[PDB]
Amino acid sequence: EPEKQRYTYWYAKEFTLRGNYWLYLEPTRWTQGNIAAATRQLTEFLTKNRNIGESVSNIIWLQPVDLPLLLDVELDDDVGAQDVPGIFAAVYSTAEQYLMPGAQRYRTEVLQNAGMSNDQIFEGPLLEHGWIPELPAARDYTQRLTLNLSRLVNSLLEIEGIKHVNRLRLDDSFDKTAIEPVKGDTWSWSIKEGYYPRLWGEDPLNQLAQQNGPLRVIAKGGISVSVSKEQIQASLPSQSLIQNEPVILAYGQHRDVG
Amino acid sequence: SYYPVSDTLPPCYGLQHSLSESEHLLPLHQFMLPFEQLLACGCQQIAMLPRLLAFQREGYEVWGDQWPFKSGSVNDDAHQDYAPALKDLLGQIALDSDHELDIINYLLGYFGTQRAPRTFTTQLDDFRAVQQGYL
Amino acid sequence: IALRIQDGVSLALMAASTASTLSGGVDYLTLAWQNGLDNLNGFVPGEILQATR
């Protein structure tokens, strides 16, 4: 927690409590629908993980800011017309995992296929859902946070039908919380103290499908085709909820050695 | 011409026997059917080779959908209840007509030119005959 | 070979009866290992033993 308000108490003179922290919660799109359900589950969890001399004092919830993100995609020459809903799902997914730092979880046996040992998999705490060997390296929420998007273009250049991007800007939707572009570069923006990016709220039906152009696809010079909401969700990668059962050695055949 | 694999089996299995005299005849004679159509696709596609590699192409039609058994045969009489349904799923070959556009890209490559890229204003039925007469 | 046990022939005695038709009988340990015997005397008299070479 900040050092200025650290449970300072009189009754005699000034005495500050050493050892209680605060946490900043960046909730997802689901739990911002139901804040009260996530509140009762986290308050159950922090008593089970309460350590020896430390406790939570203050819980901070975060507030979304829609980050409009004009970007003009130009498509390749030899794409199919039916592969274009595959494009809209792809340019959405690689835009989320860079702007919104999402932790990647996957099964234990996938890690056993990889080269790292059994000491490396079970390193952290017991995770019932997936394993997180790499962290997303979340930035601190004590200060305001810059978001550099010059790294984005190769993550956007990666996908098969995409040959290049033509624009990367925002249409004056940053003034509500005074997001200032840092010193000279056009790509970076610094969101003010409490907020976190929500780049396209209610994403496909509100923004991507309506042909208002938050994302303009250009295909074969100028034909500029678009898509509806439900067509890209079928070509969207659907995640799988995975639960990790405990590892045991099963019995062999009992032999009458007695 | 295709001669059935159910002919070459020993006659005690009953494939050339009179139909449904014993009850074990029919589940056996449906077991030889999927391994017959896989071999009947191989006999069509060699007979399609003057059609598959001609320069004056005119067809949607690729690998093949013909029934393996002649119409008088006893092997036809076993599956006569679902021969109209099996021939119609054999007409999935029209859905595989994108492959025919990959051979025209190969046959045009003899003369140094690739095929045209696929556009959005195709009218893909009328697009293709332009690509056929080009070859 | 498959062999039917009969009433208190030992494994040392039964592995000698394999030498009639196995070109040198299986040892009484390697007969017990192949059948998966829990014990050297852990067979019931009804049980069928197997003696491969």
Tab-separated table of C-alpha atoms in Angstrom:
chain	number	residue	atom	x	y	z
A	1	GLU	CA	0.000	0.000	0.000
A	2	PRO	CA	1.029	3.673	-0.270
A	3	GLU	CA	3.267	4.727	2.594
A	4	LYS	CA	1.299	7.829	3.560
A	5	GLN	CA	-1.824	5.911	4.712
A	6	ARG	CA	-0.582	2.686	6.292
A	7	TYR	CA	-3.083	2.197	9.143
A	8	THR	CA	-1.632	4.977	11.247
A	9	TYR	CA	-3.304	5.144	14.649
A	10	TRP	CA	-3.187	7.149	17.841
A	11	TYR	CA	-4.401	5.673	21.189
A	12	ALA	CA	-0.771	7.430	22.705
A	13	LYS	CA	1.262	9.167	19.959
A	14	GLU	CA	1.595	8.168	16.284
A	15	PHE	CA	1.976	4.453	15.572
A	16	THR	CA	1.909	3.051	12.048
A	17	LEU	CA	0.966	-0.547	11.324
A	18	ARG	CA	3.606	-2.455	9.425
A	19	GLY	CA	2.358	-5.176	7.119
A	20	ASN	CA	-0.966	-4.844	5.318
A	21	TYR	CA	-1.198	-4.353	1.555
A	22	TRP	CA	-3.781	-3.296	-1.028
A	23	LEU	CA	-4.606	-4.963	-4.339
A	24	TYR	CA	-5.868	-3.518	-7.618
A	25	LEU	CA	-8.417	-5.679	-9.419
A	26	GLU	CA	-8.737	-5.364	-13.184
A	27	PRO	CA	-11.968	-7.286	-13.838
A	28	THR	CA	-12.926	-8.929	-17.095
A	29	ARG	CA	-15.832	-8.389	-19.477
A	30	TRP	CA	-17.867	-11.076	-17.711
A	31	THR	CA	-17.404	-9.922	-14.104
A	32	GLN	CA	-18.137	-6.307	-14.977
A	33	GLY	CA	-21.584	-7.610	-15.833
A	34	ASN	CA	-21.915	-9.040	-12.302
A	35	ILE	CA	-19.624	-7.294	-9.815
A	36	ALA	CA	-21.466	-8.691	-6.780
A	37	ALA	CA	-20.802	-12.319	-7.730
A	38	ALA	CA	-17.039	-11.817	-8.005
A	39	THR	CA	-16.970	-9.932	-4.704
A	40	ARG	CA	-18.267	-12.841	-2.612
A	41	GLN	CA	-15.856	-15.296	-4.249
A	42	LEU	CA	-12.697	-13.239	-3.729
A	43	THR	CA	-13.595	-12.512	-0.094
A	44	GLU	CA	-13.800	-16.272	0.428
A	45	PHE	CA	-10.416	-16.760	-1.232
A	46	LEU	CA	-8.352	-14.202	0.687
A	47	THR	CA	-9.052	-15.764	4.087
A	48	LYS	CA	-7.870	-19.144	2.817
A	49	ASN	CA	-4.645	-17.557	1.540
A	50	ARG	CA	-4.062	-15.109	4.401
A	51	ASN	CA	-0.419	-15.156	5.408
A	52	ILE	CA	1.356	-14.851	8.710
A	53	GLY	CA	1.576	-11.100	9.349
A	54	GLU	CA	-0.192	-9.555	6.368
A	55	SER	CA	-3.768	-8.925	5.299
A	56	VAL	CA	-5.684	-6.995	2.679
A	57	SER	CA	-6.875	-3.571	3.779
A	58	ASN	CA	-8.296	-1.970	0.639
A	59	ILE	CA	-9.552	-3.513	-2.609
A	60	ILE	CA	-9.500	-1.394	-5.766
A	61	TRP	CA	-11.824	-2.053	-8.699
A	62	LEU	CA	-10.984	-0.639	-12.096
A	63	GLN	CA	-13.051	1.284	-14.619
A	64	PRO	CA	-13.091	0.731	-18.392
A	65	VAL	CA	-12.179	3.229	-21.097
A	66	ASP	CA	-13.170	2.353	-24.652
A	67	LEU	CA	-10.058	2.722	-26.786
A	68	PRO	CA	-11.492	3.297	-30.271
A	69	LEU	CA	-8.452	2.241	-32.347
A	70	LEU	CA	-8.896	3.126	-35.993
A	71	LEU	CA	-6.780	0.699	-37.962
A	72	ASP	CA	-7.058	0.199	-41.709
A	73	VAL	CA	-6.256	-3.386	-42.691
A	74	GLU	CA	-5.275	-4.124	-46.279
A	75	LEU	CA	-5.878	-7.705	-47.350
A	76	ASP	CA	-3.864	-9.989	-49.613
A	77	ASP	CA	-4.524	-10.613	-53.299
A	78	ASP	CA	-5.410	-14.306	-53.195
A	79	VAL	CA	-7.729	-14.562	-50.191
A	80	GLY	CA	-11.042	-16.314	-50.586
A	81	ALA	CA	-14.277	-14.435	-50.011
A	82	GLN	CA	-15.261	-17.003	-47.386
A	83	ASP	CA	-11.964	-16.594	-45.498
A	84	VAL	CA	-12.793	-12.964	-44.659
A	85	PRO	CA	-14.795	-13.847	-41.499
A	86	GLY	CA	-11.608	-15.707	-40.599
A	87	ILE	CA	-9.768	-12.396	-40.928
A	88	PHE	CA	-12.060	-10.347	-38.654
A	89	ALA	CA	-11.787	-12.942	-35.886
A	90	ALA	CA	-8.011	-13.059	-36.262
A	91	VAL	CA	-7.374	-9.308	-36.207
A	92	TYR	CA	-9.534	-9.082	-33.103
A	93	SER	CA	-7.777	-11.836	-31.155
A	94	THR	CA	-4.211	-10.602	-31.668
A	95	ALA	CA	-5.375	-7.090	-30.826
A	96	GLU	CA	-6.756	-8.236	-27.475
A	97	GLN	CA	-3.810	-10.279	-26.218
A	98	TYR	CA	-1.385	-7.393	-26.784
A	99	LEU	CA	-3.470	-4.540	-25.344
A	100	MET	CA	-5.187	-6.579	-22.624
A	101	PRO	CA	-2.495	-8.728	-20.953
A	102	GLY	CA	-4.173	-12.099	-20.699
A	103	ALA	CA	-2.523	-15.008	-18.934
A	104	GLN	CA	-2.184	-18.157	-21.033
A	105	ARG	CA	-3.162	-21.447	-19.389
A	106	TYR	CA	-2.857	-24.925	-20.837
A	107	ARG	CA	-2.814	-28.544	-19.762
A	108	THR	CA	-0.055	-30.388	-17.904
A	109	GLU	CA	0.444	-33.038	-20.608
A	110	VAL	CA	1.135	-30.302	-23.157
A	111	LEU	CA	3.993	-29.205	-20.896
A	112	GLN	CA	5.148	-32.822	-20.664
A	113	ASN	CA	5.425	-32.847	-24.449
A	114	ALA	CA	7.686	-29.801	-24.158
A	115	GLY	CA	11.278	-29.970	-23.012
A	116	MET	CA	10.973	-28.522	-19.513
A	117	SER	CA	10.949	-30.930	-16.603
A	118	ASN	CA	8.403	-31.821	-13.940
A	119	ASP	CA	10.147	-29.458	-11.529
A	120	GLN	CA	9.299	-26.490	-13.766
A	121	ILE	CA	5.593	-27.260	-14.275
A	122	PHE	CA	4.489	-27.444	-10.637
A	123	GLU	CA	6.560	-24.463	-9.500
A	124	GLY	CA	3.926	-21.967	-8.400
A	125	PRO	CA	0.870	-22.508	-6.262
A	126	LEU	CA	-1.641	-25.242	-7.002
A	127	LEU	CA	-3.628	-24.201	-10.065
A	128	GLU	CA	-6.861	-26.104	-10.629
A	129	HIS	CA	-7.299	-24.552	-14.093
A	130	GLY	CA	-4.293	-24.663	-16.416
A	131	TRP	CA	-0.673	-23.840	-15.698
A	132	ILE	CA	0.887	-20.399	-16.061
A	133	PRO	CA	4.658	-20.821	-16.573
A	134	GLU	CA	5.058	-17.366	-18.147
A	135	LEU	CA	3.480	-14.292	-16.619
A	136	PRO	CA	1.964	-11.470	-18.702
A	137	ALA	CA	4.171	-9.007	-16.712
A	138	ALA	CA	1.381	-6.715	-15.566
A	139	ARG	CA	2.268	-3.072	-15.083
A	140	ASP	CA	1.843	-1.470	-11.666
A	141	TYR	CA	-1.295	0.478	-10.873
A	142	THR	CA	0.393	2.993	-8.586
A	143	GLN	CA	1.147	5.221	-11.597
A	144	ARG	CA	-0.521	5.954	-14.915
A	145	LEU	CA	0.330	3.554	-17.716
A	146	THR	CA	1.598	4.085	-21.242
A	147	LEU	CA	0.479	1.695	-23.982
A	148	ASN	CA	2.992	1.431	-26.827
A	149	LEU	CA	1.477	0.097	-30.049
A	150	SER	CA	4.505	0.175	-32.354
A	151	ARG	CA	5.019	-3.480	-31.418
A	152	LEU	CA	1.452	-4.255	-32.586
A	153	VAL	CA	2.024	-4.055	-36.337
A	154	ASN	CA	4.027	-7.275	-36.713
A	155	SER	CA	1.497	-9.053	-34.511
A	156	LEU	CA	-1.019	-7.680	-37.008
A	157	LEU	CA	1.231	-8.444	-40.012
A	158	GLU	CA	1.489	-12.075	-38.908
A	159	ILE	CA	-1.848	-13.419	-40.114
A	160	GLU	CA	-2.129	-15.006	-43.542
A	161	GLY	CA	-4.475	-12.717	-45.444
A	162	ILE	CA	-3.027	-9.532	-43.988
A	163	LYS	CA	-0.347	-7.908	-46.146
A	164	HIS	CA	-0.091	-4.561	-44.295
A	165	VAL	CA	-2.005	-2.057	-42.178
A	166	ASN	CA	-2.630	1.507	-43.354
A	167	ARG	CA	-3.614	3.475	-40.221
A	168	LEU	CA	-3.278	3.390	-36.407
A	169	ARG	CA	-5.055	6.196	-34.542
A	170	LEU	CA	-7.937	7.209	-32.268
A	171	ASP	CA	-10.950	9.395	-33.115
A	172	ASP	CA	-11.010	11.804	-30.146
A	173	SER	CA	-12.398	9.253	-27.685
A	174	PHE	CA	-9.494	9.795	-25.266
A	175	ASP	CA	-10.478	13.248	-23.986
A	176	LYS	CA	-12.948	11.958	-21.382
A	177	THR	CA	-10.092	10.973	-19.047
A	178	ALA	CA	-7.394	13.213	-20.643
A	179	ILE	CA	-5.223	10.496	-22.192
A	180	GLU	CA	-2.187	12.371	-23.431
A	181	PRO	CA	0.092	11.096	-26.204
A	182	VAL	CA	3.610	10.936	-24.791
A	183	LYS	CA	6.405	13.178	-26.017
A	184	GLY	CA	6.724	12.666	-29.785
A	185	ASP	CA	5.538	9.245	-30.848
A	186	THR	CA	2.130	8.747	-32.436
A	187	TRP	CA	1.660	5.165	-31.271
A	188	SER	CA	1.782	5.504	-27.487
A	189	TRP	CA	-0.959	6.749	-25.168
A	190	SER	CA	-1.025	7.049	-21.376
A	191	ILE	CA	-4.286	6.212	-19.610
A	192	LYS	CA	-4.890	8.174	-16.397
A	193	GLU	CA	-4.464	6.583	-12.906
A	194	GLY	CA	-7.385	4.196	-12.382
A	195	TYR	CA	-8.565	3.126	-15.802
A	196	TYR	CA	-7.754	0.136	-18.030
A	197	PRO	CA	-8.395	-0.248	-21.788
A	198	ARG	CA	-11.620	-1.838	-23.069
A	199	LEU	CA	-10.705	-1.161	-26.686
A	200	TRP	CA	-14.024	-2.197	-28.312
A	201	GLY	CA	-16.807	-2.554	-25.769
A	202	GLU	CA	-19.433	-5.175	-26.737
A	203	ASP	CA	-17.021	-5.731	-29.630
A	204	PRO	CA	-18.539	-7.292	-32.799
A	205	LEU	CA	-22.185	-6.138	-32.785
A	206	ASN	CA	-21.322	-2.686	-31.465
A	207	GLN	CA	-18.211	-1.986	-33.543
A	208	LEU	CA	-16.854	-4.534	-35.989
A	209	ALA	CA	-19.908	-5.738	-37.905
A	210	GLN	CA	-21.831	-2.517	-38.416
A	211	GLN	CA	-19.656	-1.009	-41.230
A	212	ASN	CA	-19.160	2.284	-39.438
A	213	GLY	CA	-15.431	1.625	-39.731
A	214	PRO	CA	-13.570	1.170	-36.480
A	215	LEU	CA	-11.678	-1.426	-38.537
A	216	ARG	CA	-11.706	-0.975	-42.314
A	217	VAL	CA	-10.691	-4.029	-44.348
A	218	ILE	CA	-9.439	-3.223	-47.853
A	219	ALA	CA	-9.368	-6.166	-50.245
A	220	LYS	CA	-8.235	-6.209	-53.890
A	221	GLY	CA	-7.501	-2.515	-54.219
A	222	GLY	CA	-10.821	-1.135	-53.038
A	223	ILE	CA	-13.684	-3.649	-52.787
A	224	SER	CA	-13.780	-3.218	-48.978
A	225	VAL	CA	-15.929	-6.127	-47.844
A	226	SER	CA	-17.441	-6.569	-44.370
A	227	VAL	CA	-19.056	-9.187	-42.157
A	228	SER	CA	-21.770	-9.613	-39.524
A	229	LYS	CA	-21.455	-10.476	-35.837
A	230	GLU	CA	-22.199	-14.191	-35.733
A	231	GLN	CA	-20.154	-15.192	-38.783
A	232	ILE	CA	-16.779	-14.516	-37.170
A	233	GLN	CA	-17.621	-16.256	-33.896
A	234	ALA	CA	-17.725	-19.592	-35.715
A	235	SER	CA	-14.246	-18.918	-37.093
A	236	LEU	CA	-13.215	-17.519	-33.710
A	237	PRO	CA	-11.048	-19.807	-31.557
A	238	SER	CA	-13.256	-21.034	-28.729
A	239	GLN	CA	-11.357	-21.752	-25.532
A	240	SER	CA	-11.877	-24.878	-23.434
A	241	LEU	CA	-12.353	-24.921	-19.684
A	242	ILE	CA	-9.840	-27.388	-18.278
A	243	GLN	CA	-9.623	-28.806	-14.754
A	244	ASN	CA	-6.469	-30.463	-13.423
A	245	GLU	CA	-7.109	-33.693	-11.523
A	246	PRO	CA	-4.630	-34.817	-8.827
A	247	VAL	CA	-1.780	-37.080	-9.910
A	248	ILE	CA	-1.637	-40.522	-8.275
A	249	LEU	CA	0.035	-43.876	-8.848
A	250	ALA	CA	-2.675	-46.492	-9.294
A	251	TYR	CA	-2.415	-49.849	-7.549
A	252	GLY	CA	-0.873	-52.891	-9.112
A	253	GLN	CA	-2.236	-56.381	-8.670
A	254	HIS	CA	-2.150	-57.444	-5.032
A	255	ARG	CA	-0.163	-60.636	-4.626
A	256	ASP	CA	-0.580	-63.140	-1.801
A	257	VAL	CA	2.931	-62.971	-0.388
A	258	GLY	CA	1.650	-63.285	3.167
B	1	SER	CA	-14.292	-51.605	-65.697
B	2	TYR	CA	-14.525	-52.669	-62.062
B	3	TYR	CA	-14.907	-56.237	-60.867
B	4	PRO	CA	-16.096	-56.576	-57.276
B	5	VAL	CA	-13.965	-57.813	-54.396
B	6	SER	CA	-17.031	-59.659	-53.092
B	7	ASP	CA	-16.748	-61.973	-56.105
B	8	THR	CA	-13.277	-63.263	-55.255
B	9	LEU	CA	-14.154	-64.388	-51.724
B	10	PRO	CA	-14.832	-68.109	-51.140
B	11	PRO	CA	-18.444	-69.103	-51.802
B	12	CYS	CA	-19.022	-70.377	-48.287
B	13	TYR	CA	-19.196	-66.763	-47.114
B	14	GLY	CA	-22.310	-66.506	-49.267
B	15	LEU	CA	-21.737	-63.281	-51.187
B	16	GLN	CA	-22.742	-64.834	-54.512
B	17	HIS	CA	-25.396	-66.972	-52.813
B	18	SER	CA	-29.130	-66.405	-53.070
B	19	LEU	CA	-30.117	-63.287	-51.182
B	20	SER	CA	-31.049	-63.465	-47.468
B	21	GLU	CA	-31.359	-67.241	-47.401
B	22	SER	CA	-29.443	-67.142	-44.113
B	23	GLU	CA	-29.473	-64.164	-41.787
B	24	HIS	CA	-25.693	-63.734	-41.624
B	25	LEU	CA	-25.570	-62.813	-45.323
B	26	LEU	CA	-26.773	-59.227	-44.959
B	27	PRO	CA	-24.460	-57.880	-42.178
B	28	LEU	CA	-21.490	-59.315	-44.052
B	29	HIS	CA	-22.569	-57.827	-47.360
B	30	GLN	CA	-22.782	-54.347	-45.833
B	31	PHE	CA	-19.306	-54.728	-44.337
B	32	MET	CA	-17.734	-55.144	-47.772
B	33	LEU	CA	-19.515	-52.022	-49.041
B	34	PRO	CA	-17.230	-49.261	-47.588
B	35	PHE	CA	-14.095	-51.082	-48.716
B	36	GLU	CA	-15.682	-51.512	-52.142
B	37	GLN	CA	-16.390	-47.830	-52.725
B	38	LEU	CA	-12.831	-46.908	-51.747
B	39	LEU	CA	-11.584	-49.244	-54.469
B	40	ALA	CA	-14.254	-48.108	-56.916
B	41	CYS	CA	-12.993	-44.544	-56.567
B	42	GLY	CA	-9.577	-45.784	-57.640
B	43	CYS	CA	-10.886	-47.430	-60.795
B	44	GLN	CA	-12.854	-44.362	-61.883
B	45	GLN	CA	-10.002	-41.901	-61.522
B	46	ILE	CA	-7.748	-43.769	-63.944
B	47	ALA	CA	-10.599	-43.809	-66.462
B	48	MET	CA	-11.088	-40.093	-65.828
B	49	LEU	CA	-7.487	-39.327	-66.783
B	50	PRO	CA	-8.189	-38.335	-70.423
B	51	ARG	CA	-10.940	-36.138	-68.970
B	52	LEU	CA	-8.898	-34.901	-66.009
B	53	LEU	CA	-5.928	-33.753	-68.078
B	54	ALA	CA	-7.507	-32.623	-71.347
B	55	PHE	CA	-6.814	-29.058	-72.396
B	56	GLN	CA	-10.421	-28.553	-73.566
B	57	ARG	CA	-12.047	-28.885	-70.159
B	58	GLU	CA	-15.815	-28.414	-69.789
B	59	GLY	CA	-16.843	-29.884	-66.449
B	60	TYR	CA	-17.436	-29.368	-62.776
B	61	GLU	CA	-17.011	-33.079	-62.368
B	62	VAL	CA	-13.998	-34.619	-60.632
B	63	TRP	CA	-12.854	-37.817	-58.954
B	64	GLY	CA	-16.063	-39.847	-59.298
B	65	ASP	CA	-19.462	-40.902	-58.025
B	66	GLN	CA	-20.409	-44.037	-59.975
B	67	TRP	CA	-21.902	-47.056	-58.227
B	68	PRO	CA	-19.496	-50.037	-58.125
B	69	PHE	CA	-21.977	-52.791	-58.980
B	70	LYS	CA	-23.710	-53.432	-62.279
B	71	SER	CA	-27.481	-53.212	-62.112
B	72	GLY	CA	-28.140	-56.898	-62.750
B	73	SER	CA	-25.702	-58.118	-60.112
B	74	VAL	CA	-26.626	-59.806	-56.839
B	75	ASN	CA	-24.408	-57.315	-54.996
B	76	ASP	CA	-26.734	-54.551	-56.157
B	77	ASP	CA	-29.748	-56.424	-54.774
B	78	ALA	CA	-28.492	-56.392	-51.186
B	79	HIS	CA	-28.268	-52.611	-50.832
B	80	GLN	CA	-31.235	-51.835	-53.073
B	81	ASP	CA	-33.074	-50.127	-50.221
B	82	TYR	CA	-30.425	-47.432	-49.763
B	83	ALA	CA	-28.768	-47.249	-53.189
B	84	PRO	CA	-30.686	-43.986	-53.919
B	85	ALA	CA	-29.339	-42.498	-50.687
B	86	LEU	CA	-25.756	-43.678	-51.192
B	87	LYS	CA	-25.574	-42.354	-54.758
B	88	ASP	CA	-26.729	-38.921	-53.592
B	89	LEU	CA	-24.015	-38.561	-50.952
B	90	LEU	CA	-21.703	-39.781	-53.695
B	91	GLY	CA	-22.788	-36.552	-55.385
B	92	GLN	CA	-20.626	-34.644	-52.908
B	93	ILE	CA	-18.022	-34.510	-55.696
B	94	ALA	CA	-19.588	-31.292	-57.001
B	95	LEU	CA	-18.593	-29.743	-53.661
B	96	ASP	CA	-14.991	-30.746	-54.437
B	97	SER	CA	-14.970	-28.691	-57.668
B	98	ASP	CA	-12.526	-26.159	-56.203
B	99	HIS	CA	-9.835	-28.777	-56.948
B	100	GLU	CA	-10.650	-28.450	-60.654
B	101	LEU	CA	-9.559	-24.804	-60.439
B	102	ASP	CA	-6.212	-25.973	-59.063
B	103	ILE	CA	-5.563	-28.148	-62.109
B	104	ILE	CA	-6.317	-25.303	-64.515
B	105	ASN	CA	-3.737	-23.313	-62.549
B	106	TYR	CA	-1.403	-26.251	-63.180
B	107	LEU	CA	-2.297	-26.732	-66.843
B	108	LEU	CA	-1.927	-23.023	-67.602
B	109	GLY	CA	1.543	-23.222	-66.057
B	110	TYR	CA	2.766	-25.182	-69.067
B	111	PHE	CA	2.466	-21.949	-71.053
B	112	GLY	CA	4.068	-19.711	-68.432
B	113	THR	CA	0.904	-18.031	-67.127
B	114	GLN	CA	-0.797	-18.593	-63.797
B	115	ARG	CA	-4.540	-18.693	-63.350
B	116	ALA	CA	-6.484	-15.557	-62.492
B	117	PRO	CA	-6.944	-14.610	-58.825
B	118	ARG	CA	-10.410	-15.149	-57.408
B	119	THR	CA	-12.347	-11.904	-57.008
B	120	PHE	CA	-15.434	-10.860	-55.068
B	121	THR	CA	-17.616	-10.089	-58.100
B	122	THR	CA	-17.028	-13.571	-59.580
B	123	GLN	CA	-20.410	-15.122	-60.213
B	124	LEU	CA	-18.327	-18.270	-59.692
B	125	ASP	CA	-20.353	-20.372	-62.137
B	126	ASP	CA	-19.749	-17.905	-64.970
B	127	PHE	CA	-16.227	-17.097	-63.756
B	128	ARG	CA	-15.070	-20.667	-64.257
B	129	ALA	CA	-16.011	-21.164	-67.918
B	130	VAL	CA	-13.949	-18.076	-68.715
B	131	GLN	CA	-11.080	-19.818	-66.932
B	132	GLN	CA	-11.814	-23.009	-68.873
B	133	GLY	CA	-11.852	-21.474	-72.347
B	134	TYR	CA	-8.653	-19.619	-71.466
B	135	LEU	CA	-6.855	-22.962	-71.316
C	1	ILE	CA	2.402	-76.144	-22.932
C	2	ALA	CA	-0.611	-75.826	-20.652
C	3	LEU	CA	-0.679	-78.132	-17.624
C	4	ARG	CA	-3.420	-79.105	-15.201
C	5	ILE	CA	-2.265	-79.348	-11.565
C	6	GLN	CA	-3.471	-82.280	-9.415
C	7	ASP	CA	-3.509	-82.272	-5.598
C	8	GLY	CA	-0.244	-81.486	-3.956
C	9	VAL	CA	2.319	-81.939	-6.668
C	10	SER	CA	4.881	-79.273	-5.930
C	11	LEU	CA	6.232	-76.695	-8.333
C	12	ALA	CA	9.574	-78.492	-8.150
C	13	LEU	CA	7.788	-81.705	-9.141
C	14	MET	CA	5.612	-80.144	-11.846
C	15	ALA	CA	8.526	-78.415	-13.579
C	16	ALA	CA	10.195	-81.801	-13.972
C	17	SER	CA	7.110	-83.081	-15.805
C	18	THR	CA	7.578	-80.310	-18.372
C	19	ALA	CA	10.920	-81.845	-19.393
C	20	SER	CA	9.065	-84.731	-21.046
C	21	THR	CA	8.030	-82.452	-23.921
C	22	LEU	CA	9.929	-79.161	-23.702
C	23	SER	CA	13.576	-80.126	-24.533
C	24	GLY	CA	14.928	-79.502	-21.075
C	25	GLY	CA	12.241	-78.428	-18.651
C	26	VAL	CA	11.644	-74.903	-17.455
C	27	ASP	CA	13.245	-74.108	-14.118
C	28	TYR	CA	10.914	-73.971	-11.141
C	29	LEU	CA	11.537	-70.236	-10.812
C	30	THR	CA	11.103	-69.395	-14.494
C	31	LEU	CA	7.931	-71.478	-14.484
C	32	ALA	CA	6.617	-69.395	-11.587
C	33	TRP	CA	7.601	-66.119	-13.245
C	34	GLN	CA	5.802	-66.859	-16.521
C	35	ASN	CA	2.510	-67.760	-14.850
C	36	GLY	CA	2.785	-64.735	-12.568
C	37	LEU	CA	2.744	-66.778	-9.381
C	38	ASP	CA	2.442	-64.772	-6.178
C	39	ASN	CA	4.163	-67.607	-4.316
C	40	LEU	CA	6.031	-70.800	-5.096
C	41	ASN	CA	3.184	-72.779	-3.529
C	42	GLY	CA	0.533	-70.221	-4.456
C	43	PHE	CA	-1.455	-72.366	-6.868
C	44	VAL	CA	-4.763	-74.097	-6.249
C	45	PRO	CA	-4.994	-77.697	-7.554
C	46	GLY	CA	-7.628	-76.688	-10.093
C	47	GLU	CA	-5.456	-74.039	-11.728
C	48	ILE	CA	-3.877	-74.319	-15.186
C	49	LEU	CA	-0.201	-73.396	-15.492
C	50	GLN	CA	1.575	-72.405	-18.704
C	51	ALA	CA	5.146	-73.411	-19.584
C	52	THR	CA	6.637	-71.655	-22.596
C	53	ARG	CA	10.271	-71.718	-23.663
